[model samples]
Target: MKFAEHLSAHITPEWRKQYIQYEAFKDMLYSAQDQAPTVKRYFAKFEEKFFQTCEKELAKINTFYSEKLAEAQRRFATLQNELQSSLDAQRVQHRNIKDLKLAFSEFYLSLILLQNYQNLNFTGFRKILKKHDKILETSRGADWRVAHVEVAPFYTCKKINQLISETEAVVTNELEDGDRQKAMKRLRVPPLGAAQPAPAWTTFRVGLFCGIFIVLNITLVLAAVFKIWPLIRIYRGGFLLIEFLFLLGINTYGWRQAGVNHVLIFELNPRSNLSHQHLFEIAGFLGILWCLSLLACFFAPISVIPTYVYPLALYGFMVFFLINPTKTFYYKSRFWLLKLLFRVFTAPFHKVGFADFWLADQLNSLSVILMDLEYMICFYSLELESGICHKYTYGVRAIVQCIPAWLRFIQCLRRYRDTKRAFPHLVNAGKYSTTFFMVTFAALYSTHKERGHSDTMVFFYLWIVFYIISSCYTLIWDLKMDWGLFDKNAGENTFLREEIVYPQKAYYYCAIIEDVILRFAWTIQISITSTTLLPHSGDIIATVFAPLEVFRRFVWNFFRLENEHLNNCGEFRA
Candidate 1:
């Protein structure tokens, strides 16, 4: 069973690229025909000898029974019929189980793949879309497969979701066993048990509105004392005090939420024998603290308090949360926050074209997964202690929190080292990772240098402004390189149409996006942070607002690189 030889005839460079680039495309072919089956053949090599001997024995016994006991033979004839029926039933059940399992697993995996694709970073993803549009111009086929692959059209997303449902439906078709059929019956027969149809979208909206109204009443009470909503200020004196309490409380809560499970991460680094539940919780706690202080200030609406209190609180929260995560922060809200951000900033960007946007987006997502996998490997190698295995699996908590990203980093590191050896350019594209982390380092150092005793809200506000500046830059660049909001808005389909028909060209475009924007943004950010010549402010409030231009420059450079990369490297694909 030399699998390499087996696959060599079938696997082309184009297909291998597809496997490496899009994981789902690679997974569909793994079926019963593949090695290591659960519902093995009855007469497989391992079982053949045993069954042959049994048949021989049964033949001999049958001859003896015929010779010695005609009466017994007559009695046993009915039993033989019953046994044959039972065996037939068992065979059908086994086949059904295999079918159901295969369908269920495929659908589940596809769902995750689709979901992950939608969650990719926008800037790099946008370039991929640009390539997709280019590909589409040369596309052929009734359904525009080439164009769709080049730039995932909006219809593709909807279709992929539908594909998942269809896969599940295949499982449902096979589930005809008494137990399964009975379960289905039970599901259909609800407590009120009349024929029930799904509610219309309008009905759903009404219910959602009612629920929001109820929650709004509760929020009014919780927010009344401190006036987190300062615009409707009933009491001016309690504003600062209430605002402080609100910021501190949210930050603390966020830290606590993130520090909950802390399972041993297994993604990239399977070798991390120890779990860092405490540390990850602390990380979450710190991240939340950092985020919440900004959130509190944003909501707190006072003129001066936000300017002074916010940034100081951010630094203090980071320091505190970083110290003890296991007891405090243990949630999966970070990814959720990113998803929300995507909804806010990128939703409109997705609608310009269905096929190109979806395909490009999916390709970028695969890149994110690969990058995250590398991050996981590095984190695992660094975090795992000598003798610890903290395995925590509970509901969504286990899925989101307990398992660490560190393990994924370890796995990715090994793969990356190999990939770099084979194709050095790919590894170099990882400059984004270095830049991202470097900016983080600079931010911490700068904040520390300005030792904030007061003017906390102002610094808090400044950090928010800094992040916004970075996000805006990313958003604009994404519109150009990845989403083609500028170009494709007018109907550029060249890149998206090329992927299927001329995949090498599609790949060229894909690699450029990954290499230039997605791969290099973080590194550029780092460059900005390390080289900036901004002086430290003596006043915390003044200091918060002071670094705005420098930070803007730091982020703006990356956006500039995005344009540069598209102009320089996008030609490679062309």
Candidate 2:
């Protein structure tokens, strides 16, 4: 099926740029569907205002920032000249030192606000350059963003951080006496738009209640944790491979097609990240093994090994494949994963890096599936009949579920210690900290508690209140920091960044709604338990949401990296 051409098969010569972009765009849409799905029922071909408006937009942003950068340049140098002159044996007063420092600080602020717009705008423009060839094709690739766009945002090459550190030292030595810390605070980045009043409640004061009335949530998750959810695990093992194949493959293709340099953005040996053909080939080989394990289930019973050899030995082989101690099938890659995971467990002792914390963050979603993995372990280890593996799990399961948060919490604290910049790490640590609390409350209140009093309603509502606070902060964190989005001066795109890679703005805008929506999958857990719809309904609902939670994370991964790519090209430069 000349599958590539089957995309069109025939073009009346009029089909040129349109077809090119679609196939490129189609790569992601293929992922939007999965594994070479139907390319939709024809009526193909799909702009013009984008060029002119975009060109004009680029024109002005280019000129405006260049002007601002150069102006800031001349002024800062002259300001520096004056500062040096002040200490050049010229007469100086404490009053004069005060004015000069204040002026320099304001000068830094002017540089910062303009640089702020540049970071926001430059990030948007780089993504715009990709949208050009892949979708718009406005100019020679160099002509698109290389003009002044590249030069202006070299704030890292600008080594603004270096200069900031320089002045930070001066202000500390000259302006601060016993208050060295206070001067560093004064020298921090743009708060030009005075931070708005915090949300309806900035209360992390749940410590009192968290101490006294919590962990009442065991009814929702752990009840199903020990439910012998074989089919969920079987398919999860299969779909997990295929879904990651699609997600990882599509991720690189989006970057590959759009001209984003991802291998450079993330860490690895220069040639180490897996390729599409390699990925597909490798997964097909082992992914089939995982698939056949399900076939192992059908061919047998809960098993003579009790759960069949393949099913019972899943984790063992998975570990062996990870660390079989021989160089059979690219042991380096396996070793890298082993090394990375080890770093995560001892995260507090290690220097923080993107690869470290990112994988650690991934554990957050996998925690659900992981708890199930343990459930299987506890199941066979105890070795019982239909009275089977049901009970002791409640206490142990709550802590196992908290394991993800615990690791992530440590990673954040390590970051805080390493960087000593508190705005985000403290907030992030606190967020993960709340997760430990909320999931605890979720477990403690499980319907397994067997309550019939008005008392159940009170704890249930408390759980609801905790969920909203936790989810809200997570939502804001996702938008503002992780994604590097919701730019205040995002120009035409407003809340979103100025430029975007996806063809429509909807992907970015729609993602917020989807993110907030997915944030509530646990709420479904609560609803199903409002009073049980027949005893097994709760298990079925729990089974269903487990996949959705993973799916939600899959979606989160897409945008999360897309946002990371936007930040990657700037400031870090490599």
Candidate 3:
């Protein structure tokens, strides 16, 4: 086997360099443009003489082949030693290749996950090629050693030639396969991480779902009482109030008596969502619209003219939600869209002597539910010039015109819900501040037109109480939740809590600021909404909205809020 070994070009670096230099010189002399036969003759002669001298020298070395073999044998000690050294050196090279491949795989896996594990990036794939080039260099020296050791003694043999041909095929095949594609596929993902079978309905999950449903209903009933108890008292006399007070006592005691599981099911989960609150508000308003329509038909026939307002609300909700189906808090309420259309023909106001579109409590309901509702109502009210029922009439049109705000508000609420479960404190701060202001304004404003100056005083007192109560509640919750998130209670939802308190600093860069400016698209509502807040709301509504006029050069150039917090979701994974 040793005698049959091939004489490959792989040799010691010095020997290889000498052979290559000789070959180059021979090629240059022969292939040169010099038109001289004598130059070619001389070059051929020199090459032949040099090759002969090398052959003789090599033959002399072979004559004492046994002695030379003994010397080489002593140097290596044994065949095992030679093989062991080759393996040790190969191992080090392999380790380096493995590390480089692993790094490339990690980067590749990250990029693939971002793109939903589809076709990889060309740049990212080229990184592997660069690593391969490095491996090629380190391995070049080893290949030289392997060629000399395997081929020097047994050159010009058919058996040696066959072995060389076979090895070349195997080595080239492996190289073309690119290390191991199966290994690349497994990067980043855990071992055995294949798609799991769909889980069968578990008793635990079903029981939990049912429990949440029951508790949600209970919370809705309590919310209804809180929202309408005062109105019920004023409208239905003090006897109903006494009955409600007793019911409230029972509820309070029952809530206190229930185990921790009930609190988690009812309050904790609901509180984890801003949309939950607004959704409940929407439900309450819907119920009120139904009742008001019924009462207008029975007691005051003239009040029935406004019953068409409910159908209008339905139409508005359907159209707005259909345009923005994926918005926050919408999945629950959007189901009402098609159902509302049925009422268009059957609506009491339409059946009676009223026009098909009479403005009523529909507008007021939208105003209390959405913060931007009132401003949008005023704008549309002015536009329609149908301010017959004052705020109520205008509010209905405002709800219809305020689709953009409704969409944004729902989207923000969804963001809040997504993060609030984890970072209850920060989310609670934004939610309570916004909600308290809204609810207080709504509750007082409901009677503002009726009680006149006395109601104004009531509005002020209620506003202060609402602010103080909300601030205190939110402060306590924030302190407790923040400490619990970071300190003793590092529970399952810890990821969410941490994001809320101190969001990633990388979020505040210019790239993110540029992104925000592009997202905040339109400015028509901005002027109207701002004017509704201050500096003459009526004039802002009446004025024609030119984009250039609304977005003055200074404000256009530098109008930005510090909203780089990645509260909703930082990862843009598909």
Candidate 4:
């Protein structure tokens, strides 16, 4: 039978039974009867069909409301599940209201439309939507409320300790499992006894580099003890000139290589990438400095210039290069003179608001400047006779001179406490190096006063040995702190090694070895104090050490870059 005919046959009886007693329908029936039977019969048929349409629509509305409620419940359940795991806590309340607002509005509007068909009263339809209140309360009210929410402004040490505990538990359980043993055996067997694959190129390279570094350090220690470097310095001006040329050449090559290198590198702006343009700018700037220094060396009149003047110029240039003038380097405006100066100096070079040097170049320049300071101090001390540099006087001078370094170290530590995100490695290195220098200087001053320049052998051996030990300790501490193995109470955010990829480990190894080598070389350079030309011994020490500091910083940059790269590629860890 036709749907309309079938609906009419089944729906007519039920419709009359439900609506016949109502006054509106009764009045309609009476009016039709008063007219002709033919009119009454047509009116009755119209009424019956009209009631049949209402019945069908009410049933459809019932089904639609039921399906919508079910859908809402399912979606809300899924959202609740997501809320537990999602990082965006703010969006929890947003999604709940948004999802419900849309679904509720759509369902209610359809119900409103159905009201126009017949006397729906909507009492049953209303109940169907109202039934969802339980699910809504459970999902939105109970689960998604922000009343107890708190912002994690800083990652706490307690949280890190907990994470470490969890990690240890998981690792321990996995290691003890039989499956792990089987997996290890499978890897060791290597599919039908195939020849063991060659170690990764990075691993081999890092290993070889570390081995070479160890040997070089041993040689340096032997040389320092035997006073071999002092013999080399006997050549005086010629040796110094040769050293400068070799240094310039090596530095230029390194800068060029840094431009194209994919590995992490030292830079002022942690987020910026290294590029060839930056390398070229740095090389040009260094070339200028070298040429100027050479000119000063060749001319006897320029040598009369105060030793302090050279460092002032060099440090001023570095401050201009490494730091961004527009950014906050210090709280006070007076400390921003270098930035302002750089702005004026580089104004013609670039149309921008400040100097055009890249952050990496600036950082490199800063390192060089630091080394210059060390060399200046050592050279300055050498100018004084052993007789004039008495125990009490020299001790006082060394202590007073190191006060500025100590103050800087203290300032950095204070800032680090407030801004935990700031780099600790540089500050720590500076503190340790300066402290060692201060103590060593005091000891040497006392010993020289007693021994009267005779039997200086013990002092040299002790100085070199102490420096090597202290330097090694600093490098290892840096690595340990980075790995989050230094302080058990340290935060997970500071623990760098936890989420690193296997491939990146090789880079880290290379960096650590390089750091040891660089720091050791600079330390030895500082120890080589001789009565050479007035180029400034401590200034050279500072210059050497500053550049060497980059070895660790390079590794740090690589780790940061690698993690960011992986995150961008969707390789996120929990």
- What are the per-residue Cα lDDT tens digits for candidate 3 across 42-62? 655644553444344334433
Query: Per-residue lDDT of 1-574 in model 2, one digit per residue for the tens?
Result: 2323423322211112222222444354334334323243321211233334445655665566567657766766776776787667443467777777776676665566555554554555555446545543335434645765565434234644445556567667755754667885666652322122222322232233232212322322343454343556344644554456545555555554443445545555322355444444444445555555555554454455544567556645666677879998657777887898999878888876777777776777666556556656765577524533433225566667667778888888877887687878889888887776666665556543565755666666766787787788777777777766788667878678765655667877777777777667644543332223234566577666655656666666666666666665112333
TM-score of 1: 0.24
lDDT of 4 by residue, 299-342 (tens): 32465685445434644554564465445422232233455445
Candidates sorted by TM-score, descending order?
2, 4, 1, 3
Each candidate structure's TM-score, on Cα atoms with residue i matched to residue i, is: 0.24, 0.56, 0.24, 0.33
What lDDT score belongs to each candidate, Candidate 1 first? 0.33, 0.57, 0.32, 0.38
lDDT of 3 at 412: 34
Pick the lDDT winner.
Answer: 2
Per-prediction CA RMSD (Å): 24.9, 18.2, 27.2, 28.7
The candidate 4 region of ten consecutive residues with least summed lDDT is 148-157
Q: Which digits, one per residue and each the tens of the lDDT, describe model 1 over residues 509-565?
A: 553354345423433322232322143221222222223322332222323223322
Q: Which ten residues in a row have the lowest lDDT in candidate 2?
A: 11-20
Q: How many times do residue backbones clash in model 1?
A: 89
Which candidate comes out best when scored by TM-score? 2
Ranking by lDDT: 2, 4, 1, 3
